[PDB]
Amino acid sequence: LNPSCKIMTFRPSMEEFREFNKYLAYMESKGAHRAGLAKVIPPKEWKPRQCYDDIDNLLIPAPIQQMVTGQSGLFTQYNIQKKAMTVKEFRQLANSGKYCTPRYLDYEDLERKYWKNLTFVAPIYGADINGSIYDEGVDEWNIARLNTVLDVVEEECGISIEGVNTPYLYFGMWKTTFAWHTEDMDLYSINYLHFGEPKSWYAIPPEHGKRLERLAQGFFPSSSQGCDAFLRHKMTLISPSVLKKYGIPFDKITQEAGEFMITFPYGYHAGFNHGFNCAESTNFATVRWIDYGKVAKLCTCRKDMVKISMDIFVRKFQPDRYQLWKQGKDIYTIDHTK
Ligand SMILES: [Cl-]
Ligand SMILES: [Cl-]
Ligand SMILES: [Cl-]
Ligand SMILES: [Cl-]
Ligand SMILES: [Fe+3]
Ligand SMILES: [Zn+2]
Numbered sequence: 495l496n497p498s499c500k501i502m503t504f505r506p507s508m509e510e511f512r513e514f515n516k517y518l519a520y521m522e523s524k525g526a527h528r529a530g531l532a533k534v535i536p537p538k539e540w541k542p543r544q545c546y547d548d549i550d551n552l553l554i555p556a557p558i559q560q561m562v563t564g565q566s567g568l569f570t571q572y573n574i575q576k577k578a579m580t581v582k583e584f585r586q587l588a589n590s591g592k593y594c595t596p597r598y599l600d601y602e603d604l605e606r607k608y609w610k611n612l613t614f615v616a617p618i619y620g621a622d623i624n625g626s627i628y629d630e631g632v633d634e635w636n637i638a639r640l641n642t643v644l645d646v647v648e649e650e651c652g653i654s655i656e657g658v659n660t661p662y663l664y665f666g667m668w669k670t671t672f673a674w675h676t677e678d679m680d681l682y683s684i685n686y687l688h689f690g691e692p693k694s695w696y697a698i699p700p701e702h703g704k705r706l707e708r709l710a711q712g713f714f715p716s717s718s719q720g721c722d723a724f725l726r727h728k729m730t731l732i733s734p735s736v737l738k739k740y741g742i743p744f745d746k747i748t749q750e751a752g753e754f755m756i757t758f759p760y761g762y763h764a765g766f767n768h769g770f771n772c773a774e775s776t777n778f779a780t781v782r783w784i785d786y787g788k789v790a791k792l793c794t795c796r797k798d799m800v801k802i803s804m805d806i807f808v809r810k811f812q813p814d815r816y817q818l819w820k821q822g823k824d825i826y827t828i829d830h831t832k
Pocket of ligand 6 (some may be wrong): 721724727796
């Protein structure tokens with residue numbers, strides 16, 4: 495049941511691990527989803543790539559420098575496009591004195607340092623590189639093809655998933671931020687940290703998502719007047735000190751190399767990288783998502799955003815509600831625990 499909605503860590507055996515879709519179902523049966531985020535640590539024998547040495551030669555065609563502005567736990571961010579570089583160049587940049595992780599005592603100490611130094615040197619990341627770095631033939635937890643209900647409708651019904659169910663690579667350095675968001679269409683996400691330094695995550699229970707939104711609206715009124723789903727721009731930073739102060743429940747956890755993090759529908763999350771690293775991610779869905787997708791608040795201020803038609807999912811997996819829904823009389827409030 496997980497009534498504290500705390501972030502759960504799972505440690506499957508090889509036998510439990512083999513089949514992603516079954517294990518996700520297990521995780522939700524233990525209440526993992528209530529926290530909005532969960533960690534899965536695979537068995538020690540499982541290795542998605544034998545050698546990472548080659549990844550040095552990969553090009554980051556569009557690195558981004560993150561420009562953070564604000565104070566006292568509230569910040570807005572904008573991006574500057576830098577020249578293309580290799581991962582090798584990026585790593586060497588990341589480990590230089592200008593950009594390297596500071597000295598610290600423990601993860602709590604480093605967390606304080608992140609929030610206290612956000613507006614000094616601007617860090618650089620590489621994101622949204624199409625690709626997977628799993629070895630060929632690795633069939634467990636293959637982010638390139640998890641084969642969820644998103645793939646079923648794409649392949650069997652010719653519906654466009656708008657590229658969200660394909661794999662992306664991310665290269666972080668110290669202090670790179672991921673601002674507060676839920677996923678496109680409030681889908682699930684999965685993130686595997688291949689190598690390098692840890693990522694720290696914050697998550698807010700889906701049952702408190704609307705409360706985070708109301709608070710963001712209060713503190714970032716101009717951003718809000720501009721877009722009904724502005725947090726989707728991923729440019730809004732809010733510190734845990736502010737969340738505590740205004741009564742928004744949340745939890746944090748640190749993801750180490752070799753660990754998966756899964757985000758759940760409408761689980762607001764954010765975080766920062768500890769240092770040079772490489773991660774791979776994608777979006778996916780289950781039947782339980784369909785109700786969130788149907789009510790997802792979309793970005794109303796630029797046409798280059800992801801919108802997926804929910805018609806097929808309702809027709810196929812909610813046939814008893816389809817007519818009602820097309821009448822615009824399928825009105826409900828989601829029970830996030832169930
Ligand atoms: Cl230092
Ligand atoms: Cl620093
Ligand atoms: Cl499903
Ligand atoms: Cl049908
Ligand atoms: Fe995310
Ligand atoms: Zn917008």
